[PDB]
Enzyme design. Structure first.
Site, PDB file in Angstrom:
ATOM      1  N   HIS A 170      -6.991  -1.408   5.012  1.00  0.00           N
ATOM      2  CA  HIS A 170      -5.998  -0.463   5.516  1.00  0.00           C
ATOM      3  C   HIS A 170      -5.886   0.740   4.587  1.00  0.00           C
ATOM      4  O   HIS A 170      -5.919   1.894   5.029  1.00  0.00           O
ATOM      5  CB  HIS A 170      -4.648  -1.164   5.668  1.00  0.00           C
ATOM      6  CG  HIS A 170      -3.634  -0.367   6.427  1.00  0.00           C
ATOM      7  ND1 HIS A 170      -3.795  -0.030   7.754  1.00  0.00           N
ATOM      8  CD2 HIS A 170      -2.443   0.155   6.048  1.00  0.00           C
ATOM      9  CE1 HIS A 170      -2.749   0.667   8.159  1.00  0.00           C
ATOM     10  NE2 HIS A 170      -1.914   0.794   7.143  1.00  0.00           N
ATOM     11  N   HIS A 209       1.515   4.030   1.735  1.00  0.00           N
ATOM     12  CA  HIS A 209       1.798   4.871   2.888  1.00  0.00           C
ATOM     13  C   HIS A 209       3.299   5.117   2.982  1.00  0.00           C
ATOM     14  O   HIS A 209       4.108   4.320   2.500  1.00  0.00           O
ATOM     15  CB  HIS A 209       1.276   4.236   4.180  1.00  0.00           C
ATOM     16  CG  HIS A 209      -0.185   4.467   4.418  1.00  0.00           C
ATOM     17  ND1 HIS A 209      -0.886   3.830   5.420  1.00  0.00           N
ATOM     18  CD2 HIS A 209      -1.075   5.270   3.789  1.00  0.00           C
ATOM     19  CE1 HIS A 209      -2.146   4.228   5.394  1.00  0.00           C
ATOM     20  NE2 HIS A 209      -2.287   5.102   4.415  1.00  0.00           N
ATOM     21  N   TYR A 229      -8.883   4.654  12.838  1.00  0.00           N
ATOM     22  CA  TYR A 229      -9.860   4.933  11.798  1.00  0.00           C
ATOM     23  C   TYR A 229     -11.260   5.031  12.390  1.00  0.00           C
ATOM     24  O   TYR A 229     -11.586   4.375  13.383  1.00  0.00           O
ATOM     25  CB  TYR A 229      -9.854   3.840  10.727  1.00  0.00           C
ATOM     26  CG  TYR A 229      -8.584   3.715   9.913  1.00  0.00           C
ATOM     27  CD1 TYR A 229      -7.544   4.625  10.050  1.00  0.00           C
ATOM     28  CD2 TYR A 229      -8.435   2.685   8.994  1.00  0.00           C
ATOM     29  CE1 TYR A 229      -6.388   4.505   9.300  1.00  0.00           C
ATOM     30  CE2 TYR A 229      -7.286   2.557   8.241  1.00  0.00           C
ATOM     31  CZ  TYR A 229      -6.266   3.469   8.397  1.00  0.00           C
ATOM     32  OH  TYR A 229      -5.121   3.340   7.646  1.00  0.00           O
ATOM     33  N   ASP A 272       5.510   4.897   5.209  1.00  0.00           N
ATOM     34  CA  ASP A 272       6.364   3.927   5.883  1.00  0.00           C
ATOM     35  C   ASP A 272       6.615   2.677   5.050  1.00  0.00           C
ATOM     36  O   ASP A 272       7.266   1.747   5.541  1.00  0.00           O
ATOM     37  CB  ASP A 272       5.758   3.537   7.235  1.00  0.00           C
ATOM     38  CG  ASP A 272       4.383   2.921   7.102  1.00  0.00           C
ATOM     39  OD1 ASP A 272       3.591   3.405   6.267  1.00  0.00           O
ATOM     40  OD2 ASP A 272       4.095   1.946   7.828  1.00  0.00           O
ATOM     41  N   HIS A 273       6.119   2.629   3.812  1.00  0.00           N
ATOM     42  CA  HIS A 273       6.368   1.498   2.922  1.00  0.00           C
ATOM     43  C   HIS A 273       6.608   1.889   1.469  1.00  0.00           C
ATOM     44  O   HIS A 273       7.264   1.127   0.752  1.00  0.00           O
ATOM     45  CB  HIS A 273       5.202   0.503   2.979  1.00  0.00           C
ATOM     46  CG  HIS A 273       4.796   0.129   4.370  1.00  0.00           C
ATOM     47  ND1 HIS A 273       5.561  -0.686   5.176  1.00  0.00           N
ATOM     48  CD2 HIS A 273       3.709   0.468   5.102  1.00  0.00           C
ATOM     49  CE1 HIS A 273       4.961  -0.835   6.343  1.00  0.00           C
ATOM     50  NE2 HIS A 273       3.834  -0.147   6.324  1.00  0.00           N
ATOM     51  N   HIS A 314       4.993  -5.017   8.217  1.00  0.00           N
ATOM     52  CA  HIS A 314       5.604  -4.953   9.535  1.00  0.00           C
ATOM     53  C   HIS A 314       5.847  -6.369  10.030  1.00  0.00           C
ATOM     54  O   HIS A 314       4.894  -7.160  10.107  1.00  0.00           O
ATOM     55  CB  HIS A 314       4.718  -4.184  10.512  1.00  0.00           C
ATOM     56  CG  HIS A 314       4.645  -2.716  10.228  1.00  0.00           C
ATOM     57  ND1 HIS A 314       5.529  -1.810  10.771  1.00  0.00           N
ATOM     58  CD2 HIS A 314       3.797  -1.997   9.455  1.00  0.00           C
ATOM     59  CE1 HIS A 314       5.228  -0.596  10.347  1.00  0.00           C
ATOM     60  NE2 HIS A 314       4.180  -0.682   9.547  1.00  0.00           N
ATOM     61  N   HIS A 353       0.851  -1.180   0.000  1.00  0.00           N
ATOM     62  CA  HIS A 353       0.000   0.000   0.000  1.00  0.00           C
ATOM     63  C   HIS A 353       0.890   1.234   0.000  1.00  0.00           C
ATOM     64  O   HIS A 353       2.083   1.163   0.305  1.00  0.00           O
ATOM     65  CB  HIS A 353      -0.969   0.014   1.189  1.00  0.00           C
ATOM     66  CG  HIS A 353      -0.299   0.110   2.524  1.00  0.00           C
ATOM     67  ND1 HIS A 353       0.343  -0.957   3.113  1.00  0.00           N
ATOM     68  CD2 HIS A 353      -0.188   1.143   3.393  1.00  0.00           C
ATOM     69  CE1 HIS A 353       0.827  -0.584   4.284  1.00  0.00           C
ATOM     70  NE2 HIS A 353       0.521   0.686   4.477  1.00  0.00           N
TER      71      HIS A 353
HETATM   72 ZN   LIG Z   1       0.154   2.159   6.485  1.00  0.00          ZN
HETATM   73 ZN   LIG Z   2       2.479   0.602   8.025  1.00  0.00          ZN
END
Ligand SMILES: [Zn+2]
Ligand SMILES: [Zn+2]
Ligand SMILES: CO[C@@](NC(=O)[C@H](C(=O)O)c1ccc(O)cc1)(C(=O)O)[C@@H]1NC(C(=O)O)=C(CSc2nnnn2C)CO1
Ligand SMILES: CO[C@@](NC(=O)[C@H](C(=O)O)c1ccc(O)cc1)(C(=O)O)[C@@H]1NC(C(=O)O)=C(CSc2nnnn2C)CO1
Ligand SMILES: CO[C@@](NC(=O)[C@H](C(=O)O)c1ccc(O)cc1)(C(=O)O)[C@@H]1NC(C(=O)O)=C(CSc2nnnn2C)CO1
Ligand SMILES: CO[C@@](NC(=O)[C@H](C(=O)O)c1ccc(O)cc1)(C(=O)O)[C@@H]1NC(C(=O)O)=C(CSc2nnnn2C)CO1
Ligand SMILES: [Zn+2]
Ligand SMILES: [Zn+2]
Ligand SMILES: [Zn+2]
Ligand SMILES: [Zn+2]
Ligand SMILES: [Zn+2]
Ligand SMILES: [Zn+2]
Lengths: 264, 264, 264, 264
Positions: C158, C84, C189, C86-87, C223, C82
């Site tokens: 997510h 975001h 959320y 952090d990825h 993660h 996805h």
């Molecule tokens: Zn995320």
């Molecule tokens: Zn994440």
């Protein structure tokens, strides 16, 4: 020994100091902050905004528009001097919440599309939400909103798509020629032999002469201190303001002095 | 009395006449058609393609790459002279089927992003599949692939993002300076007082001088007839080819004659 | 009383703790950090990267690729779970410095195009340099690189474009079925009655069943702690790893408990 | 033996037959052509347009807006059923000449961004000027313009981003529930085992049930003949119009018959 954290774009507090709408001409208002210029032009067919400031100024720009009687659906067009986060920050949020269209040249459009990332001199250090340009304008092209014509003048240097905007307003019937020129500074740039900008010096020199020849009775800049404006003192804000000649020649002296100290 | 049907971009048959790879220098080949230039440069780290031609030439460009021993995954970069459908047509399909990256300036990128639509002079008449530019290059910037350096020279006029590409190849060890300059024509354009292009004349005049000063031992153009190339006669293709001086001065004479007949 | 400064995306130090390439299968390696998964798949025709981590991990991802013998021009494709920060952080920089192409679905592409801004739940708080998707993939579509086929499985929740990737590798000749599924969490959320995501609950429920039915002998997550991986202990990293059934059922219990405590 | 010329998107003459604004409800009008639906919704805060038709219908859509008293600057939003050239053609030109914003889902946005090129079933055969989506909407999201709420219902099948729009209007005070559902046809598609659309059958089946459950007192489709509308007979245009149940069940019978004849 981990990797470093991300650093946030932190500016002086006076850049984020909100102020009330200060009138410039009959149809021109300053609705930004004390040290950031955001010009609003009210016409018979809506409003026009020039620059916005830091990204967290979106709510402030909408409140002052309401003070002037400009509903969100009345903001028609967004014009940009250059696409750095301290001036094109809230553009993406303003488009969603106003239905306005963005007009900029090809260089400002591609820099606005990637949110200031991959900057020629700053990299990914100063970023902001990306926005798409709706209309591409050329050098010398005229933008007409509500009978008021905005002429674009390309002055590359600070950014490749740096643009000066000119229009003729009135001050109690008497005409006034406004020139909102972009910053001519080169803060921390590599001037000679830049692989990302090989013609940087030639672009600055041709931009100095461009500002000098702008038809201008009243000059404004994205940063008020660059043209000796002072938004805090109200009626005396434009007292010590510089001319186009004085603004360009003062920036060229700082450019040559900075270019000379780079050779060392 | 209904609305008119859509008209297709129809060109001369010689533009779509496929030909075999014709060698230009040790590392440079012509893999386009008889009347459309598509240059391939083979290096130790992959290949480079300059222009592609009509959109339906994608399969032909891949077959000649296979003839030269260039697999689809070996095409590294795509360079463009300008983003018209007769030269940047198969770029979108070539990106999907080769994994190559596109490098162009801001003006060519925004015109390539909307597939030639909203043209300054042609409107939506000549369109093609859109493609996104992966790397934005500036005037005078160097692009290096496999040890071969490509220098970009902006020559605005035909399109705002018209670009001439130069690189130094060899001809059996002996060095050769190749200059692939864009078309200097203005077919059916409004030259004086164009609202979509107010500085069109000044851009053409500054582009004429730019072509004259290009370091060039061998000139090529997107259309071979513009520089008196003849891809059909094989070894004698570059016999009557023009110089950069002769190409620019011949186009400027046609420009001034066309500019004079527009005043009438 | 000025406006607030911009806040930087600050994460735990273990997310930025660099590690050496840890082998997962014959062709699969972990080259991210201790608490962030970045999978590299080496084939006969180049390499494939799945996720990248925080934006400041670009240099680390390139160093471990060099340790495995993967030159920048050998990275062929970038796949995302996805979009975001952090990825998918260093994706924009990795495209410029490797010549790789990005494949993602329509929802991940539009979120990657605006750099995580205008998030459905986070707004403009967590942003990163924007990147353009080169190939749009559909649910169940197969991506083949060097003889290794990657199948996409849409698991919205997510993010609307959350995607699980599956492929069959080997472990000393013996086949192994790898399933790299995305996070099933909903951190902070609004689940019931979200105007930006009216079908959020139905998308999560259909995603729980999707993960359970993935063909998987070895599960990995963006993660490592989500699937009980532990990249720090080397050979024992996958010892206590969960199955697809255990991962989906554990996340659904946390979802129903979080959905029940939102009603209060 | 040269390469083939480009072929133009040529449709039946009745698709391009202009007609006068035909009233559907108190605030809803048909301003397209005889065989192409273009719905205009006039509110107290501007207008809303749903689809536009062929790309050469831009001037016709603006003339009928003037007949209804809708200036170009009064068109606020553009909604799309799907991004094929026979319905999203003049969207790019309408954005430039009206200042309106486009709202669509992620799949319609990415297809609108590349102008219908790289179609899952048609390739580059049917293309049109590209346009950028300004607001991304999710399944079940509500769009409110001038007090009138538009609810989006995703019905993937004809295109991955096919969308049905519903809103409640009035007919002389008495309320009416309008459902503008997209085409459920699969003209010449490969249904079973499509590598570009592996879940095409499951998406069509879930879309058939979606249309059946739409709250609808009056159904319209992008093609009037699909729902037995007849824009030419004026007041009797909706006489033989089908229900949502009859429209979905009739399309599913044609789908199963087409799916059965593909097995042969
Ligand atoms: Zn995320
Ligand atoms: Zn994440
Ligand atoms: C990118 O924003 C500028 N710089 C910064 O904000 C900081 C920097 O100096 O790096 C970071 C810049 O453009 O240099 C802005 N611009 C001007 C200007 O007048 O151009 C003045 C004055 C400094 O602040
Ligand atoms: C847009 O493509 C060009 N024109 C056309 O193909 C046709 C036109 O003339 O309108 C349509 C053009 O750019 O004018 C191309 N370009 C050149 C050139 O040499 O630039 C030559 C020669 C004509 O064909
Ligand atoms: C946006 O990045 C996540 N959150 C954050 O980094 C912080 C937050 O929680 O808001 C900010 C998120 O997606 O919620 C990421 N994602 C996951 C996950 O496993 O999805 C875990 C665990 C938390 O960190
Ligand atoms: C792409 O435009 C459609 N097809 C075509 O115009 C032609 C084709 O059939 O290939 C070309 C299509 O979508 O199939 C359109 N769509 C519908 C529909 O009702 O969906 C009907 C009826 C046919 O015309
Ligand atoms: Zn700046
Ligand atoms: Zn600044
Ligand atoms: Zn051309
Ligand atoms: Zn041409
Ligand atoms: Zn269609
Ligand atoms: Zn159709």
């Amino acid at each position: 020994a981990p990797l470093p954290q991300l650093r946030a774009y932190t500016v002086d507090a006076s850049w984020l100091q909100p102020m009330a709408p200060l009138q410039v001409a009959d149809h021109t208002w300053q609705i930004g902050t004390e040290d950031l210029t955001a010009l609003l032009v009210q016409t018979a067919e809506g409003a026009v905004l020039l620059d916005g400031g830091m990204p967290q100024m979106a709510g402030h720009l909408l409140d002052n528009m309401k003070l002037r009687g400009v509903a969100p659906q009345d903001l028609r067009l967004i014009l940009l001097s250059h696409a750095h986060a301290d001036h094109a920050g809230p553009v993406a949020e303003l488009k969603r919440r106003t239905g306005a269209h963005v007009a900029a040249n090809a260089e400002t459009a591609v820099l606005l599309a990637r949110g200031g990332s991959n900057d020629l001199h700053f990299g990914d250090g100063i970023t902001y939400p990306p926005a798409s340009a709706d209309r591409i304008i050329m050098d010398g092209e005229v933008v007409t909103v509500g009978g008021i014509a905005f002429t674009a003048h390309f002055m590359p240097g600070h950014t490749p798509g740096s643009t000066a905007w000119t229009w003729t307003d009135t001050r109690d019937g008497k005409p006034v020629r406004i020139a909102y020129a972009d910053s001519l500074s080169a803060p921390g740039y590599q001037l000679k032999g830049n692989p990302r900008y090989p013609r940087l010096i030639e672009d600055y020199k041709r931009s100095f002469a461009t500002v000098r020849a702008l038809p201008c009775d009243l000059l404004l800049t994205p940063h008020p201190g660059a043209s000796n404006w002072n938004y805090a003192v109200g009626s005396k804000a434009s007292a010590e303001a510089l001319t186009c000649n004085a603004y360009a020649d003062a920036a060229e002296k700082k450019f040559d002095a900075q270019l000379a100290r780079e050779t060392a």
